[PDB]
Amino acid sequence: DIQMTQTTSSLSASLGDRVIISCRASQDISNYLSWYQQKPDGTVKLLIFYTSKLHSGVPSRFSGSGSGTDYSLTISNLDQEDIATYFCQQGNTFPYTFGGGTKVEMRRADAAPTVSIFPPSSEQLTSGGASVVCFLNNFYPKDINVKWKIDGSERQNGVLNSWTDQDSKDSTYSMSSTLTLTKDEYERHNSYTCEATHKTSTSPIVKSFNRNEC
Amino acid sequence: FNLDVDSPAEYSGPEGSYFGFAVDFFVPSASSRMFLLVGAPKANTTQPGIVEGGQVLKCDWSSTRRCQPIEFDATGNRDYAKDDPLEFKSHQWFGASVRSKQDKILACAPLYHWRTEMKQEREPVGTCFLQDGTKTVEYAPCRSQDIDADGQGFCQGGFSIDFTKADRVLLGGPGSFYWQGQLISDQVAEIVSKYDPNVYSIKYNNQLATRTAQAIFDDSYLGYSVAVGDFNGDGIDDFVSGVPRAARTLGMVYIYDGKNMSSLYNFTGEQMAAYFGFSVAATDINGDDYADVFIGAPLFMDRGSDGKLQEVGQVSVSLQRASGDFQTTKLNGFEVFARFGSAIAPLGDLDQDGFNDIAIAAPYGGEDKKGIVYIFNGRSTGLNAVPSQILEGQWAARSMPPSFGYSMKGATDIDKNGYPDLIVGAFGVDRAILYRARPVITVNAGLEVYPSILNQDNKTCSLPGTALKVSCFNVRFCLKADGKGVLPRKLNFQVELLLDKLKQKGAIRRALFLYSRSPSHSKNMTISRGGLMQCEELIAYLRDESEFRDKLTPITIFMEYRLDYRTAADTTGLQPILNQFTPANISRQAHILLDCGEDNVCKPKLEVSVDSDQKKIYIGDDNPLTLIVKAQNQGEGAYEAELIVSIPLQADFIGVVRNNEALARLSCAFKTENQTRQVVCDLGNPMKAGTQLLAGLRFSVHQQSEMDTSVKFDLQIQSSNLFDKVSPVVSHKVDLAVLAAVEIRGVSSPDHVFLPIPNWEHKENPETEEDVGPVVQHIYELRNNGPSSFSKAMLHLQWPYKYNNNTLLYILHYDIDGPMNCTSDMEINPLRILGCGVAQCLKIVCQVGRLDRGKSAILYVKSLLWTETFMNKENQNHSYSLKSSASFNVIEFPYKNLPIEDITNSTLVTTNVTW
Amino acid sequence: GPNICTTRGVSSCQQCLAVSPMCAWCSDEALPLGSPRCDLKENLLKDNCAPESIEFPVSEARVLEDRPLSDKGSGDSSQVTQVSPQRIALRLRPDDSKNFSIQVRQVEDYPVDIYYLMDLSYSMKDDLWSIQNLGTKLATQMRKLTSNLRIGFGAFVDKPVSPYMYISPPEALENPCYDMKTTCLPMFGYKHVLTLTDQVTRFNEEVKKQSVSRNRDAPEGGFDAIMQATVCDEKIGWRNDASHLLVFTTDAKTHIALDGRLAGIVQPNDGQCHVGSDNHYSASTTMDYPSLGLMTEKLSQKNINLIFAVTENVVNLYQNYSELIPGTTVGVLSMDSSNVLQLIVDAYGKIRSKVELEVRDLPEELSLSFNATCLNNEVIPGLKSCMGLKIGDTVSFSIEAKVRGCPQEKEKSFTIKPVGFKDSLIVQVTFDCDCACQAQAEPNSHRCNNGNGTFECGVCRCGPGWLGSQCECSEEDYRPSQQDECSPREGQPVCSQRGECLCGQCVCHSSDFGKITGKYCECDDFSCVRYKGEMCSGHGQCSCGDCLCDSDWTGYYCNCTTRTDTCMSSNGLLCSGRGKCECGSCVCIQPGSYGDTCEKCPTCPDACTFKKECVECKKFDRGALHDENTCNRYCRDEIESVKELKDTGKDAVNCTYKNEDDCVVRFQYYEDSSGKSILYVVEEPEC
Amino acid sequence: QVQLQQSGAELAEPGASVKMSCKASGYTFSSFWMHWVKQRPGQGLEWIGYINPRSGYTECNEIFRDKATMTADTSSSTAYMQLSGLTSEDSAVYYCASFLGRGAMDYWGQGTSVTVSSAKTTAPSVYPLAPVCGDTTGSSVTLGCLVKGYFPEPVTLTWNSGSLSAGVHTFPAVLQSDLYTLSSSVTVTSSTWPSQSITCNVAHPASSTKVDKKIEPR
Ligand SMILES: [Mn+2]
Ligand SMILES: [Mn+2]
Ligand SMILES: [Mn+2]
Ligand SMILES: [Mn+2]
Ligand SMILES: [Mn+2]
């Protein structure tokens, strides 16, 4: 069936801005296109139908632009409840084809991430195995590349990744890397390190944890 | 009766528009000028491309006339695509139905076509439009997401509509669900609020609709007609609808609750294709605060005269009762091919008598099939079937019969007066006519004379005519007149009096004026307001002795009066009318100076007495009763004496006797009101002395329920005498109830049994028919027939099961008739598929609930004769009489009072077996 | 002698006759100052008059035309005559009656028309298939029953606009079945195919040309089709002298009148035929479905026997409709229509078996009474119809016409004819009320004496306020001394006590009821026998307390109906012969049976003793014990002979019975065989 | 006032057939089309098909053909989509949607989160992870508790019994192919620091046990 392409998946914008959400159809659908707003908790309300029409309670801020293939949801002066994930959906022919959705990202001045490690302790120290968690919290623009280092070496397998939807009140992204290890693999090396590269500064932020006792 | 037929208003639309197919009043809250709404479903319109889109017109009655079309929609068809029409407005018949409530008016296009949202199908969804403040909304209830003959694509929504007392529209579409039909109701507020023009099917909160039902109900046309009114309990308007094709074209009328679509009562047609349900109406005919249902069945064929069938049309009148069970009556058309019940329009109270009224139309009846509307007044009892007025046809014909009365609207008073008015539409002539009610007048006439007596020796007054000692008396008439509504103030009446009655043809005139020397007299009277009864006196004298032939006769003074038409007032004009029955004249009478003494006045002793013959009440089934009466006056002449027999209010009068020659063949009369249950018979104004009369009065009576203990008659004579003018009240016992003869009797269908049967053989495991032998049915029937029934009874059957060691008659199966259960002994059903006297018993006792008013219970016992049995048994083939017997005893007579009668009986049935 | 007529006013010759035809009067001076006036008959002739003018009229019914009832109606001549007198002129005096009779005959070899009106809906394709040779096959059977036969054809599916048809979303507007990939003709309202012809082959040709269509709504426009076949006598071409069968065949429901309203059809059916030159019904698109009543009146008029050939699923339905269209017949068609031929033949024999009279345009002031003589010498009273007729037999009816009063001046004609018959007895009613001297003399003020003056029959009735022979006593101040013996001879009453005795005769007065009556003013207009207290049951007028009953009523209270139609059972038989019909309700004799028609009999005796007596009748020439006569027992159907009974798993009743003379018959009985029954008859007397 | 009331989360072992419910309050259900939409975790919207109640006619998507069994109870105004033989790629939040005119589903449901997984439930353990390095844990602090062995799916992590909220970052769990892996961090003023009661409250409703672990040492 005709595929629906929204090429911009994350639109950062302040409050009051002009947000033009583009979406192109594969084949001409002759102007049957629904625009849906899925708020972050997941409830999906219909904002527009037939390329432009407001449905009941949706405010005048949502301009329905479009014809042919190229379509565009033009949000007027932005507000807080307008921060959500906007999908287009082709309804002309059968089976109904949605878009990828476009997440409206509230904009805050760039903020370096506060990173901290968590070497195993107590019950985490001995399960017969172990785990060492590295959390990076509360930063602007979200995307950042993180890796761990062991004596300079890099690994892949033991790990798991996690993130957090943009915080409201303080508007900041955060992330988790939960490292996994066994008795032998944990014992096998003396010094680990957490390393995150981000758009905030060029020199990558590296936390450092070495295991030492007496 | 008070509807002015002289000067109605005639409105007309374009030729061929069926102008008048639908009519209604418009009562806006803003402007003082009220309007009329005429549906013109075929009229050509300004809608581009839309041919015969149809429209509705508002018409001014007061001052500047004719009509302006209400512009709901100026748009043509929308396009689903380029040169691909979304809808079809051509021949959509907008205006086939128009109803209004306050500022709101609803009009519908039942033929409205709609392209599918997906497919190319153009379907008759039907549509409506609600206009109100300025504001116009499209309401397309049947235009929904499931569209085809199975869903609603064929609904034709708006085929009938009505507003509830509250704010909610009820709408009928005939075609939904393979023409099962559908009702859907929506809050008007909801409709206007949630209409979004970019949405072709709009979601409505709190809409009520029936659903698809089993496929048998297809083509039943639910929602052909519609009406609203409260029936179940109290409160909200509940829903009435005609389903004319229902029950194999018998027709029905369904009523659904207003709160939910659960349905309460059904009505059903009489015979097929009568279109019972064509029209329906709801209104309280008896003013009992319970809405009553009316159902038009215009194609009905009753049976007149010879018994030949004839389509007259028929209207049903179902009176609501607190018990929930209605009280229905029928109203038959007066002309063939009139289609009598074609439109039923409640008018409310047209005469403001306190009871609501209704107009029923036979648009194809009357001379030249010009159309007729019959108008019926309500009363305490219900609708008075004798119509008080018949509005006839105005326009004759052009192509179509005009169908005057094919549409109607009422109960909304279009002019200032306190009385409702009525519109009838005649679409066959493209016309609509407003009939306006005239204000009603109830007059109260008074009459009195100074003394009551007549004598030549009574001389009092003098006279300019001659030397006068003459017997005069004073006569004074009076009129108090009043009525609700607009009555133009001062109303003048021309009254005329005549003092004789047993005169004026010519010959001897019995009474004269002491002034104008005449038996006849006129008087220009001019009353007003509601009060101040206006009187006028005249002294009139009588003949004196000689030259008078006189009489015993009282000489009845009669007074009459008429209103003046030419002196009357209105804006254009309306002559007010008198009351329907408020008799326009009155009679009084005095007596003769004769007898009583030398006084002219006396006081007789009145005596009444009666006697029965037997007096046995039937329990209320058709019982004839005559009682012989001896009325005697032991005193002198009683003036204007008349018998007053006060009887129970449920009973009927058959007639005067004219059988026994000792009984009177005379003058008798019925009177049901002033709450009088009495019968009144005339004995004459100058009654005699020492005279005794004997008379027989036959009646017929029901005496509904548990009032049974005896029957009581009260009777008394009464007169105008000064003293002892009435007899004492006279009782009359009547013996309560009676017995009946109930009998039981039976038979065995093969009452005989012949010689050895062909293809017969006998084993001890010979399954079924060959070995068992032929079936012998023995039906036994107990029946209660007579004027009494059995509240409990006992039946005892003895069945000849076995002779000695062998089973003779083997019971296959038993059957049952009526309110009776039974139990046997020595169980019947075998391996599958004197005679009985004092001998082995196959007896079954049974308990019957009741055999009531000529009713009966019947047991059919089918058995086979067993071969085992049928073995020769020593001595060769002989004659056996197989006898079963059934007895009965009647238990619990109805009432303790009177002689409850013991009833006993029994029966025997026989089967003769020979070779 | 004086007993009647004397008591009631006289005052005129015309009055005397109006009093009654049993009364007689005199004219001129026959016996001036002689023996009494009026006083019945023969007596008056004995004293003086009736030489010349004493006019006592007798009512009469002179037959104007009697042509012989025909025998063979085959060859030409159009003579027919099946209704025995064709017209008969009746002249009646006031309140009198005269009786007469009419013999109806069903002529052997009377021609028959059969117009085949068939559902062409898709369901009927197998029907057309099984039809194609039926024309000639039916022709070969009817050849047997009647010499000259002619047949025709027409077909219908609903009406072609609005929801009834499909509004044409697709291509299928030319082809109602697109989806089923089978081409079919689009829906048509009514299509006349074949005009009635004695040429059967062209029936077969056109029927072979036909092809089926498909309908949206289950009910169909058959009643439209039926109306047009009934009312277009030019298009259909029904023969004038012939029996007319309109065979209507359908597998489905039917649209009622007023249904058309959904479609935007308002105007009601006119009864007039719109079948055009193109043989299509022009008003299907326009005019509404006809009402059952209108169909009834047109079937009755154009003289057509409607045969309902309906499928089993809808037979109860069309049976009920048939009962609402009196005279209509209905039979079961097979789903293919294989059995239509024989159903039709059986139907012909069915309706030729009955003759029912009708009376049309009967003057309201007149009333008729019927006895029917139709089986051997058997007379069933109060019956206007006879059935069970073997074709060729002639039945008879005796009629009694009674007039109420002596109605207005005009000559009125009305018609009595048998249902569905061409022949009609026309009964010309002339009302005779006149004195012979009526047109002979004129009052001319003073002619008789000097006063307000009258003159008729040589005697006179004084004018406005005068009395006596000579005209005097204007104000009644003249002869107060004339009272004498007023009602009796020197008796107690003066006159009726309703009025005053003046000039020897009485002036009548009363309440405001108006009218009244009498020489003594002894008769009122009001007091009469009452049932529920409304007039005489509301069903009668009142004169002198004597009820003069309305049309088709009897009894003192006028509550006894004259309708025998209310008493019928199992397609005839009145009170199922188990009771007698009294005032339109059956009183059962003593079956122990009850119910309105005595059809419900919970106990009842066996069939055997009555069947035995009918077997003994036909095969044994009767014999038992009581009734000595010929026959007149008719039973069941064709009894053939079998050598053995069988257990067939069918509906069978084996009855064996004895009888007088000692015979033992054994026979099985079988009902529900093609709407008929089958009696097995054991060969020979046996015993 | 239209409400689409869905079924709760539906955990079912692979191969089984779950059946979610959707109540349609506030308009006439039997007269409107009912669409179902499948949203896989962090994925786009996949239309599943529609069902017309009354008639009962249902047209599914062909990529979901022989998966989605759509029924409709018109007597309760309740749509039902059964999922036969559910595999793990059927793990998704399912959405009933009321179908408006044109091309658009108007008024949606809350969603049903069906999760296809194996074995048995296991209870969480809270490791009071403390820095064990830094410079005197410079002002404020970063501490918390990681949680794996977490298969109650929803659960709760809190600091100071809801009294201390601000500065609490709790991450969403990650499927290990069995049973889950969460972390919870907090930044609290070192002007408080171990003289304070700082307690990690981990509540897993399947185990009906609430583990409270503070961190003194490292
Ligand atoms: Mn209620
Ligand atoms: Mn009432
Ligand atoms: Mn009234
Ligand atoms: Mn008025
Ligand atoms: Mn067939």
| B472-482, strands of its sheet edge to edge | B511-513, B534-542, B472-482, B440-449, B577-578
Contact B198 A56 (CB under 8 A): no
Distance CA C146, CA C470 (A): 77
Residue type, B389: Q
Six-digit token pair at D92? 């998704």
> Per-domain residue ranges for chain B?
1-438, 439-599, 600-739, 740-915
Which pairs count as long-range contacts for C660-668, CB under 8 Å and 24+ apart, including other chains? C660/C616, C660/C623, C660/C624, C660/C625, C661/C620, C661/C623, C661/C687, C662/C687, C663/C616, C663/C620, C663/C687, C664/B754, C665/C612, C665/C615, C667/C615
Distance CA B893, CA B896 (A): 8
How distant is the Cα of A70 from the closest Cα of chain B, in angstroms?
Answer: 20
Residue type, C277: S
**How far from C661 is each of A37, A48, C621, C658, CA to CA, in Å?**
106, 104, 12, 9
Whether C40 and C86 share a structural domain: no
- When scoring D1, D2, D25, D28 by the number of chain B Cβ atoms within 10 A, the one with the most, hence best to mutate, is D28
- CA angle, C425 then C426 then C431, to 5°: 135
Taking Cα atoms as reference points, which of B506, B683, B272 lies closest to residue C467? Answer: B506
> B508 and B495 in contact (C-beta within 8 Å)?
no
**How far from B91 is each of B21, B108, B124, B158, B871, CA to CA, in Å?**
15, 13, 11, 15, 87
Find residue B674's DSSP bridge partners.
none
Element of type H or E holding C207: helix C201-209
In the listed set C420, C450, C475, which residue is the last one of a domain according to the structure?
C475
Six-digit token pair at B550? 């006189």
- CA angle, C539 then C544 then C548, to 5°: 30
How big is chain B, counted in residues? 915
Instruction: State which residue of chain B sits closest to A49, comparing Cα positions.
Output: B198
Domains of chain A (ranges; CATH) run: 1-107 (2.60.40.10), 108-211 (2.60.40.10)
Say which CATH architecture domain D1-118 belongs to.
Answer: Sandwich (2.60)
Distance CA B467, CA B261 (A): 91
Distance CA C681, CA C348 (A): 27
> B590 and B451 in contact (C-beta within 8 Å)?
yes
**A neighbour chains, 3+ CB pairs within 8 Å:** B, D
Distance CA B362, CA B370 (A): 10
Topology match between the domains D1-118 and D119-218:
yes
- What's the burial of B139, exposed, middle or buried (CB within 10 Å: 0-12/13-18/19+)? buried
Find residue B539's DSSP bridge partners.
B474
Whether C51 and C85 share a structural domain: no
B703 Ramachandran zone, left/alpha/beta (phi>0; psi -120 to 50): left
Instruction: State which residue of chain D sits closest to A115, comparing Cα positions.
Output: D142
| Å from CA of C124 to ligand 5 middle | 4
Distance CA C602, CA C595 (A): 10
Q: How many CA atoms lie within 13 A of B119 on its CB side?
A: 11
| Å from CA of D78 to ligand 1 middle | 29
| Å from CA of C309 to ligand 5 middle | 13
Six-digit token pair at A83? 């921060």
How distant is the Cα of C673 from the closest Cα of chain B, in angstroms?
Answer: 23
- B419 is known to lie in a ligand binding site: yes
Taking Cα atoms as reference points, which of B800, B797, B863, B862 lies closest to residue B824? Answer: B797
Technique used by the depositors: X-ray
By Cβ distance, the residue of B145, B199, B212 closest to D33 is: B145
The bridge status of strand C112-119 relative to strand C149-156 is parallel
Whether C409 and C439 share a structural domain: no
Residue with the two structure tokens 């939910």: B260
| Å from CA of B377 to ligand 3 middle | 5
Distance CA C660, CA C664 (A): 10
| Å from CA of B128 to ligand 1 middle | 27
Element of type H or E holding B693: strand B692-701
Q: Would you call D55 an interface residue with chain B, using a CB distance cutoff of 8 Å? A: yes
Find residue A146's DSSP bridge partners.
A196
Whether C190 and C306 share a structural domain: yes
Element of type H or E holding B813: strand B809-814
Residue B81 with chain A: CB contacts under 8 Å:
30
How distant is the Cα of B550 from the closest Cα of chain C, in angstroms?
Answer: 10
Distance CA B139, CA B125 (A): 11
Find residue B67's DSSP bridge partners.
B59
Residue B309 with chain C: CB contacts under 8 Å:
293, 296, 324, 326
φ, ψ at A60 (rounded to 5°): -70, -5
Find residue D37's DSSP bridge partners.
D47, D95
Q: How many domains does chain C have?
A: 6
Residue with the two structure tokens 């197919």: B21
φ, ψ at B433 (rounded to 5°): -125, 125
Contact B146 D100 (CB under 8 A): no
Distance CA B741, CA B737 (A): 14
Distance CA C588, CA C609 (A): 20
How distant is the Cα of D19 from the closest Cα of chain B, in angstroms?
Answer: 25
Element of type H or E holding B43: none
Distance CA D133, CA B445 (A): 121
What is the rounded end-to-end Cα distance, in angstroms, of chain C?
Answer: 71
What's the CATH fold of domain B439-599? Immunoglobulin-like (2.60.40)
Radius of gyration of chain D (CA): 23
Topology match between the domains B1-438 and B740-915:
no
Quick one: resolution in A? Answer: 3.6
The bridge status of strand B511-513 relative to strand B534-542 is antiparallel
Element of type H or E holding B178: helix B176-179
Six-digit token pair at A47? 């904002």
Please state which CATH number belongs to domain B740-915.
2.60.40.1530
Q: Give the other-Cβ count within 10 Å of B704's Cβ.
A: 8
Q: Would you call D101 an interface residue with chain B, using a CB distance cutoff of 8 Å? A: yes
- B292 is known to lie in a ligand binding site: yes
- What's the burial of C251, exposed, middle or buried (CB within 10 Å: 0-12/13-18/19+)? buried
> C505 and C521 in contact (C-beta within 8 Å)?
no
How big is chain D, counted in residues? 218
Six-digit token pair at C13? 């010759």
Q: Would you call C546 an interface residue with chain B, using a CB distance cutoff of 8 Å? A: no
**Longest CA span, chain A:** 76
Residue D143 with chain A: CB contacts under 8 Å:
118
How distant is the Cα of D124 from the closest Cα of chain A, in angstroms?
Answer: 12
Contacts of C643 (CB under 8 A, 6+ apart): C683
Residue type, C458: G
Six-digit token pair at B783? 């029946």
| Å from CA of B197 to ligand 5 middle | 49
> C27 and C53 in contact (C-beta within 8 Å)?
yes
Instruction: State which residue of chain B sits closest to D103, comparing Cα positions.
Output: B117
**D neighbour chains, 3+ CB pairs within 8 Å:** A, B
Whether C534 and C549 share a structural domain: yes
DSSP C112-141: EEEEEEEE-BGGGHHHHHHHTTHHHHHHHH
DSSP C307-329: EEEEEGGGHHHHHHHHHHSTT-E
**How far from B238 is each of A13, B164, B212, B224, B377, CA to CA, in Å?**
57, 8, 20, 17, 25
How big is chain C, counted in residues? 687
- B83 is known to lie in a ligand binding site: no
Find residue C381's DSSP bridge partners.
C371
Distance CA C198, CA B365 (A): 43
Whether C97 and C149 share a structural domain: no
Whether C45 and C71 share a structural domain: no
Q: Give the other-Cβ count within 10 Å of C659's Cβ.
A: 17
Please state which CATH number belongs to domain D119-218.
2.60.40.10
Distance CA B225, CA B110 (A): 13
Distance CA C592, CA C576 (A): 13
> D148 and D203 in contact (C-beta within 8 Å)?
no
- When scoring D6, D183, D202, D211 by the number of chain A Cβ atoms within 10 A, the one with the most, hence best to mutate, is D183
Q: How many CA atoms lie within 13 A of B543 on its CB side?
A: 16
> B223 and B173 in contact (C-beta within 8 Å)?
yes
Taking Cα atoms as reference points, which of B206, B334, B234, B316 lies closest to residue B270? Answer: B316
Instruction: State which residue of chain B sits closest to A92, comparing Cα positions.
Output: B118
Helices (H), C266-358: 292-301, 315-324, 340-351
Whether C4 and C74 share a structural domain: no
Element of type H or E holding B357: strand B357-362
| B87-88, strands of its sheet edge to edge | B87-88, B113-115, B122-124
Distance CA B158, CA B96 (A): 8
Identify the CATH assignment for B1-438 out of 3.40.50.1820, 2.130.10.130, 3.30.200.20, 1.25.40.80.
2.130.10.130
> C86 and C67 in contact (C-beta within 8 Å)?
yes
| Å from CA of B145 to ligand 3 middle | 47
Element of type H or E holding B424: strand B422-426
Find residue B514's DSSP bridge partners.
none
Residue A44 with chain D: CB contacts under 8 Å:
95, 108
> B661 and B590 in contact (C-beta within 8 Å)?
no
How distant is the Cα of C565 from the closest Cα of chain B, in angstroms?
Answer: 7
Return the axis-axis angle of helices C134-145 and C340-351, rounded to nearest 10°: 30
> C526 and C541 in contact (C-beta within 8 Å)?
no
Q: How many CA atoms lie within 13 A of D20 on its CB side?
A: 29
Distance CA C143, CA C140 (A): 5
Instruction: State which residue of chain C sits closest to B243, comparing Cα positions.
Output: C259
> D181 and D95 in contact (C-beta within 8 Å)?
no
By Cβ distance, the residue of C253, C264, C476 closest to B507 is: C476
DSSP state of C281: B
Provide the CATH number for the domain around residue C581: 2.10.25.10
Residue D31 with chain B: CB contacts under 8 Å:
144-146, 201, 209
Residues of A (40-79) whose Cβ lies below 8 Å from D: 42-46, 48-50, 55
DSSP B261-324: S-EEEEEE-SSTTS-TTSEEEEE-SS-SSS-EEEEEETT-EEEETTTEEEE--EEEEEE--TTS
Contact B749 C606 (CB under 8 A): yes
Six-digit token pair at A8? 């911009």
B574 CA to centre of own chain: 33
Q: Would you call D65 an interface residue with chain A, using a CB distance cutoff of 8 Å? A: no
Residues of D (122-161) whose Cβ lies below 8 Å from A: 125, 127-133, 142-144, 146, 148
Whether C637 and C513 share a structural domain: no
Contacts of C8 (CB under 8 A, 6+ apart): C19, C517, C518, C519, C523, C544
Contact C502 B774 (CB under 8 A): no
Element of type H or E holding C431: strand C425-431
How big is chain A, counted in residues? 214
Taking Cα atoms as reference points, which of C277, C153, C283 lies closest to residue C210? Answer: C153
Element of type H or E holding B130: strand B127-131
Find residue D197's DSSP bridge partners.
none
| Å from CA of B324 to ligand 2 middle | 12
DSSP state of B629: E
**How far from A120 is each of B278, B457, C503, D128, CA to CA, in Å?**
88, 146, 150, 9
Residues of B (178-217) whose Cβ lies below 8 Å from D: 198-201, 203-205, 207, 209, 211-212
> Per-domain residue ranges for chain D?
1-118, 119-218
| Å from CA of B1 to ligand 4 middle | 13
Whether C504 and C523 share a structural domain: yes
What's the CATH fold of domain B600-739? Immunoglobulin-like (2.60.40)
Number of H-type helices and E-type strands within chain C: 11, 28
Taking Cα atoms as reference points, which of C234, C246, C240 lies closest to residue C277? Answer: C234
Instruction: State which residue of chain D sits closest to A163, comparing Cα positions.
Output: D171
How distant is the Cα of B150 from the closest Cα of chain D, in angstroms?
Answer: 8
DSSP chain D: --EEEE---EEE-TT--EEEEEEEESS-GGGS-EEEEEE-TT--EEEEEEE-TTT--EEE-TTSTTTEEEEEETTTTEEEEEETT--GGG-EEEEEEEE-STT-EEEEB--EEEEE--S-------EEE--S-SSTT-SS-EEEEEEES--SSS-EEEEGGGTB-TTEEEPPP---SSS-EEEEEEE--TTTTTSS--EEEEEETTTTEEEEEE----
**How far from B326 is each of B231, B232, C592, C670, CA to CA, in Å?**
10, 12, 36, 48
Distance CA A180, CA A132 (A): 7
Distance CA D22, CA D3 (A): 10
Instruction: State which residue of chain A sits closest to D175, comparing Cα positions.
Output: A160
Six-digit token pair at A102? 């476009």
- CA angle, C503 then C506 then C511, to 5°: 140
Element of type H or E holding B780: strand B775-785
Six-digit token pair at A20? 């033009």
What is the span of the domain harbouring residue C242? 109-352
Whether C160 and C272 share a structural domain: yes
Residue type, A201: S
> B420 and B349 in contact (C-beta within 8 Å)?
yes
Q: Give the other-Cβ count within 10 Å of C377's Cβ.
A: 9
Taking Cα atoms as reference points, which of B629, B752, B615 lies closest to residue B696? Answer: B629
Contacts of D100 (CB under 8 A, 6+ apart): A46, A49, A55, B199, B201, B203, D106
Instruction: State which residue of chain B sits closest to D106, comparing Cα positions.
Output: B203
Contact C324 B272 (CB under 8 A): yes
